[PDB]
Design a protein around this nucleic acid. Structure first.
Ligand SMILES: Nc1ccn([C@H]2C[C@H](O)[C@@H](COP(=O)(O)NP(=O)(O)OP(=O)(O)O)O2)c(=O)n1
Ligand SMILES: [Mn+2]
Ligand SMILES: [Mn+2]
Length: 379
DNA sequence: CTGGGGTCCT
DNA sequence: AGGACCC
């Protein structure tokens, strides 16, 4: 049976968070910077040619009057992200997160209830909320069109509630599966919404100019396909199943070829509480071991506060480094430390330092470009 | 001048 | 422990 799925992506998420805190940034072009990367920027900046994930120098060069704010601490962004997720969970309990600013909600049950409440007179009165992709004509006698229109109404209610209770704006897309909702949400940006009626699905899927634009096909998979003369959605649709499996494996091939047709049987999973907490630090150089112990101390402090806040306990710790391509060592967290979660710091530092020395030899000079710590295996 | 996070699979 | 993917 056919579902109704909604996808929500927040507008310039980090930048919008910053503009809420410091309204003086509301009308100036704003970029959010982590080290040498303008990770996002408000739409004023995008008018002047700034783009997401530009270099700082490319951003200032394409817009010298750009105002930069540091986004290396994701605390406020994370808080807001979960405020949005909890808000959406009021509508339907089952909400799936995709990173910090995107959410999927399966509206099927809700839509059915709303239709059950309706009589025959108002069925003619049902109207779309927001955009209809490709200006496709609505057939009120088509039940799928009716249900998707109801989904557009619920989506507008969600966006409005996000603005009224969280001051956040974003785009939504309503479709029959997660792939099509996520693809259709970004058609009209920012702070708009689009519904995709079934007849336009193929159109939407062929509007893409390369397969990498499909969620599920990343850099590596895209490269492997590029090497096979596959450059369009149709090249992947029309490629031979057997050859594709032989090159990419069975599961990957079948799934991504199903995606090239706009098909997504995957359900909306409940994300719930985080499966892991982590902190990262990048830098130009780290070669003094006591420097590394200081960085790990710093990461550990914040991680400890966050773990304390959740009220859940991690049963595993990891340490990740990058050498001047990424490597990690993990180990379980001793039970008495877990219970104490007391100067839990010093034992944690000792453990993570033993892992560090397992990874890298202090006797030989070394050059590390990233130190990250992860508390996972939460219970 | 290539961040700082996350998920699940193998 | 690493690898693929997502933002
Ligand atoms: N590679 C990435 C992608 C996103 N992000 C963060 C910064 C973004 O503000 C936030 C949301 O990512 P995004 O939706 O891809 N772009 P953003 O929401 O900023 O603007 P829109 O174009 O979506 O309106 O995740 C990141 O830190 N590193
Ligand atoms: Mn966004
Ligand atoms: Mn996003």
């Amino acid at each position: 049976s056919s579902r109704v799925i909604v996808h929500v992506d927040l507008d310039c998420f980090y930048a919008q968070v910053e503009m809420i805190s410091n309204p003086e940034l509301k009308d100036k072009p704003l970029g959010v910077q982590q080290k040498y990367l303008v990770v996002t920027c408000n739409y004023e900046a995008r008018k002047l040619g700034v783009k997401k994930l530009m270099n700082v120098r490319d951003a200032k060069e394409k817009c010298p009057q750009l105002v930069l704010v540091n986004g290396e601490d994701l605390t406020r962004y994370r808080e807001m992200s979960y405020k949005v997720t909890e808000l959406l969970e009021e509508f339907s309990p089952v909400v799936e997160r995709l990173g910090f600013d995107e959410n999927f909600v399966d509206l099927t049950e809700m839509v059915e209830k709303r239709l059950q409440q309706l009589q025959s007179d108002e069925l003619s009165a049902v109207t779309v909320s927001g955009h209809v992709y490709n200006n496709q004509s609505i057939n009120l006698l088509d039940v799928l069109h009716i249900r998707l229109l109801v989904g557009s109404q619920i989506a507008a209610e969600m966006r409005e509630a996000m603005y009224n209770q969280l001051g956040l704006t974003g785009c939504a897309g309503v479709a029959s599966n997660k792939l099509l909702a996520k693809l259709v949400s970004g058609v009209f940006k920012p702070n708009q919404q689009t519904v995709l009626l079934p007849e336009s699905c193929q159109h939407l899927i062929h509007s893409l100019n390369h397969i990498k634009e499909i969620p599920g096909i990343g850099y590596k998979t895209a490269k492997c396909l590029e090497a096979l003369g596959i450059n369009s959605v149709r090249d992947l649709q029309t490629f031979s199943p057997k050859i594709l499996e032989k090159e990419l494996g069975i599961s990957v091939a079948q799934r991504i070829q199903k995606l090239s047709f706009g098909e997504d049987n995957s359900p909306v999973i409940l994300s719930g509480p985080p499966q892991s907490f982590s902190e990262e630090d990048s830098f130009k150089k780290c070669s003094s071991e006591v420097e590394a112990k200081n960085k790990i101390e710093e990461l550990l402090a914040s991680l400890l506060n966050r773990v304390c806040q959740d009220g859940r306990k991690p049963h595993t710790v990891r340490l990740i480094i990058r050498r001047y391509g990424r490597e990690s060592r993990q180990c379980p967290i001793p039970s008495h430390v877990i219970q104490k979660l007391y100067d839990v710091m010093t034992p944690m530092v000792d453990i993570l330092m033993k892992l560090f020395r397992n990874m890298v030899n202090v006797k030989m000079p070394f050059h590390l470009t990233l130190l990250s710590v992860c508390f996972c295996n939460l219970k």
